């Protein structure tokens, strides 16, 4: 009786995804508010 | 029928150290509070 008990722990870095390394972008970003925080907080909850 | 004294001075004294752990240990309701936290945390970030 097989039975699956844990999934692999991924983090993603919101700013390098997104932006790839352009001032520019970035810029542009900061003006979305917190949502990488939020990502980052659930995978982080996820691992836990 | 036979050590209904032990066995009433031994719940007697358990019930008092769990008393007394709930007392000291302030870490031991983390669960609610985690749960507390992570409602007012989605409603700050929300306002925000």
Do not use: W
């Amino acid at each position: 009786e097989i039975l699956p008990v844990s999934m692999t722990k991924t983090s993603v870095d919101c700013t390098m995804y997104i932006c790839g390394d352009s001032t520019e972008c970035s810029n542009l970003l900061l003006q979305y508010g917190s949502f990488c925080t939020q990502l980052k907080r659930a995978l982080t909850g996820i691992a836990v | 029928y036979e050590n209904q004294k032990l066995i009433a001075n031994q719940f007697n004294s358990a019930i008092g150290k769990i008393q007394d752990s709930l007392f000291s240990t302030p870490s031991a309701l983390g669960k609610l509070q985690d749960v507390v936290n992570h409602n007012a945390q989605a409603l700050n970030t929300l306002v925000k």
